Symmetry: D2
Subunit: 121 residues, 4 copies
């Protein structure tokens, strides 16, 4: 692809409390990363005709990264030219499954997402 | 002042759990608003020579807004040409003071901050 | 009202970026309040037979509280004997509506939620 | 190890934007984990005479865990009989160092903290 410049990086954490769903942790992390920010004008100032033209790169770190369903994670972003990378990281919290809380196994999975908005150089 | 265009809006919540310090709630809200984002390039793309040239407007809503110490709140921002508005809003959580937790009165004060980065037109 | 002991209070913020949907801001605030905590043993130390027996009181401050669909907000909580009280508060962020971002009007609505577990 | 009952688990994220300071990311993560919750009655239902008697276990995942100043991280917690375990994890965000923002190197370090109250 064409070289690009980083504009803003939005970071967030997401948690799968029941276990076995790193995709859920990852999706929630992307949502958390962007939910508290709004981008009314940066895209204009950068020279785009619409926010859907912005380049958005997502970097996720989570346990069992190979189990993350990419399409579901990227669909959290409302617009843009989107890419995702998934790598091992985040954290596992070990603890005996609580049936009353609908736990699937003895792990809570925590993902981190960095959502970067870039402009082509 | 010169008219300006909104680029990004970063929102956060801050809480004074002991009571009597809306300034603390407000300061924590501004910190929360910006802590999870980084701005490596937007300022460049917008035409500034340094991030300290960016216009940063802070809007805070909190109980007892008249008690907020402006200078302390604005010092949370690491750079920029800064302004603050404080208005009544946020929320008060009522509850009997717990001496063991060092409560000052029967209220927890919750502030909201919107930190907007703008560029002059 | 009744005097009950407060155990834990979880606080969160939620935002309706497009305007006219205080319910969305409120629902997101309750989610933000509870999403990053787990209560594996609170129900047991409280002497309850199941988490669904927990007494949970929710306080929300948001612009246009009268427009909040309350049961929708309470549905965010997976368990408990729940009640919600809505009041005017939180914050309105005003600014020109951005049609390209699907804004409904010139306001962003911010809600605060406090979720309290009582005994 | 010992088998103790978990009551509540509070989770948070913290970030060192300038690089080379995993301690800062870790401290901020513990703060983020607890800042938005209050525990007015947990110590009492646990049968303790004061919140300072609460057993608190902290688990942190961050890049360069060996460099974390542990007591500094634990100092974020106002009360309790506290312990911390640090492991490699969280995330490194790589990108060109921005001298104008006082970056130390080309990394941003992100830590995760889980704060558990046990009985
Ligand atoms: Cl989450
Ligand atoms: Cl806070
Ligand atoms: Cl939100
Ligand atoms: Cl942080």
């Amino acid at each position: 692809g064409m070289a690009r410049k980083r504009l803003i990086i939005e970071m967030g954490m997401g948690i799968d409390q029941h276990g076995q769903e790193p995709t859920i942790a990852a999706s929630r992390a992307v949502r958390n990363a962007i939910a508290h920010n709004a981008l009314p004008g940066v895209w204009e100032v950068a020279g785009l005709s619409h926010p859907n033209e912005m380049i958005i790169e997502v970097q996720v770190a989570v346990p069992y990264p190979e189990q993350v369903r990419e399409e579901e994670v990227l669909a959290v972003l409302p617009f843009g030219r989107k890419t995702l990378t998934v790598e091992s990281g985040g954290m596992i919290v070990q603890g005996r499954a609580i049936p009353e809380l609908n736990d699937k196994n003895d792990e809570m999975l925590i993902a981190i997402a960095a959502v970067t908005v870039l402009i082509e150089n």
